[PDB]
Design a protein around this ligand. Structure first.
Ligand code: ADP
Lengths: 57, 14, 375
């Protein structure tokens, strides 16, 4: 009987622990995209294949 | 003379 | 990140939100109680740019945003924006999860009921906080100031509450509440500066005027003599630098705005002013209470940082008070930062562990529990 009470309690707690992990994963995914947008902010001005045809032609 | 917590509570219990 | 499930303390007003954890001396971060939104059409693509901005983000990007305050005169009218402010407060700058910490919020004693009820619901439903308490601003100020007896005159951005407390108990019949606040003084300063050739009517302009007010304005000890000189000579003008390089100087307007606290008629308000209401909060209490409240006028809230205000408040009430008796003002460098400080103290008291509402009782009662358990 104690084990039934224990398994019932552990899954209630387990749900909350899994939810907490999920919340931190979600924050990483969101933070990661903000960083990627900031990366594009500074990399963008040079993302070209440049100054080749200028002499070839 | 005339709640967001109820939803989470249910998820963990179900 | 803490070694204990210390309560989080968030002093959420109509101005700035001060937040940190219980047991500390100061908030970890402060935030404008603002959610900002663009008033322009985007032209460039791949610029990031949010639909809405929160707190300091909203203020930093304000050049093209209209800025709204979810709290007006001490009450939350927009709780979706407060959920955003609290998300930011807790997860971006304090970087804590209320789910593992009790949370203490603050309000005036006659703040309409929806405020404490919605504050309770947001923290229990969106943050799933294990416990809640909504505290009295006067109580918090009294703990911060080292007193159990006195008048708490809290003249901040939202409302002036002005509640007399004796031996830690309310004397509610003597609350000389007044719908006159720092936000009205800001509005008055925008208008009086408009008269000097510097119009202030947009959001960016309003934030600038609030900054001007905080650095340049004062109430002084004697209005008529201060104006006799300020209205006659440039020697009392003070300059301010605006973000675009403009320079504004303010003369008698520098104190005529703030003076509205003593002369409310300046903005069309029908009121005796904050010093008469302070006096009446003492006078309306029993005669064996009055002596202790006269000796303990407790200053807190915003506007308490105007030059001449502590000296003036004691002068104005001692002038109405009877002779022989000594009347005194308490106005520590902890003025206005007393509500947050009190939150830290109160949250941490062992006797207060019987006041916290848990996320147990909450589910059976709902957010209305705040009216059964807090005050
Ligand atoms: N030097 C100052 N001059 C004029 N007003 C001030 C000054 N410092 C603070 N105040 C005003 O205090 C108000 C904030 O009230 P406050 O009680 O501190 O809210 P809270 O309890 O949430 O911290 C703002 O309108 C601010 O402009």
């Amino acid at each position: 009987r104690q084990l039934h009470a224990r398994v019932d309690k552990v899954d209630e707690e387990r749900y909350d622990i899994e939810a907490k992990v999920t919340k931190n994963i979600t924050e990483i995914a969101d933070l990661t995209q903000k960083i990627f947008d900031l990366r594009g902010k500074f990399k963008r001005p040079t993302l070209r294949r440049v100054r080749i045809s200028a002499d070839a032609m | 003379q005339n709640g967001k917590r109820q939803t989470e509570r249910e998820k963990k219990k179900k | 990140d803490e070694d204990e499930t210390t309560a989080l303390v968030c002093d959420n007003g109509s101005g700035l939100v001060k937040a940190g954890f219980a047991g500390d001396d100061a908030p970890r971060a402060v935030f404008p109680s603002i959610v900002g939104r663009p008033r322009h059409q985007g032209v460039m693509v791949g610029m990031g740019q949010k639909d809405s901005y929160v707190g300091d983000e909203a203020q930093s990007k304000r050049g093209i945003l209209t800025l709204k305050y979810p709290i007006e005169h001490g009450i939350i009218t927009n709780w979706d924006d407060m959920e955003k402010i609290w998300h930011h407060t807790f997860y971006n700058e304090l970087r804590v999860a209320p789910e593992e910490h009790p949370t203490l919020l603050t309000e005036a004693p006659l703040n309409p009921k929806a405020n404490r009820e919605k504050m309770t619901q947001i923290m229990f439903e969106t943050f799933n906080v294990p416990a809640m308490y909504v505290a009295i601003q006067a109580v918090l100020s009294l703990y911060a100031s080292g007193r159990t007896t006195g008048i708490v005159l809290d003249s901040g951005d939202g409302v002036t509450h002005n509640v007399p407390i004796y031996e830690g108990y309310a004397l509610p019949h003597a609350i000389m509440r007044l719908d006159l606040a720092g936000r009205d003084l800001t509005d008055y300063l925008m208008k009086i500066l408009t008269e000097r050739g510097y119009s202030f009517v947009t959001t960016a302009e309003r934030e600038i005027v609030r900054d001007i007010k905080e650095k340049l304005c004062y109430v002084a000890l004697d209005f008529e003599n201060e104006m006799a000189t300020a209205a006659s000579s440039s020697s009392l003008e003070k300059s301010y630098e605006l973000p675009d390089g403009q320079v504004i100087t303010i003369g008698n307007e520098r104190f005529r705005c703030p003076e509205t606290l003593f002369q409310p008629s300046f903005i069309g308000m029908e009121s005796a002013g904050i010093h008469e209401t302070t006096y009446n909060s003492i006078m309306k209490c029993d005669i064996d209470i009055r002596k202790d409240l006269y000796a303990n006028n407790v200053m807190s809230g915003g506007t308490t940082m105007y030059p001449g205000i502590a000296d003036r408040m004691q002068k104005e009430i001692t002038a109405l008070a009877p002779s022989t008796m000594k009347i005194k003002i308490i106005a520590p460098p902890e003025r206005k930062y007393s509500v947050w400080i009190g939150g830290s103290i109160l949250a941490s008291l062992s006797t207060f562990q019987q006041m916290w509402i848990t996320k147990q009782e909450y589910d059976e009662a709902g957010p209305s529990i705040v009216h059964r358990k807090c005050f």
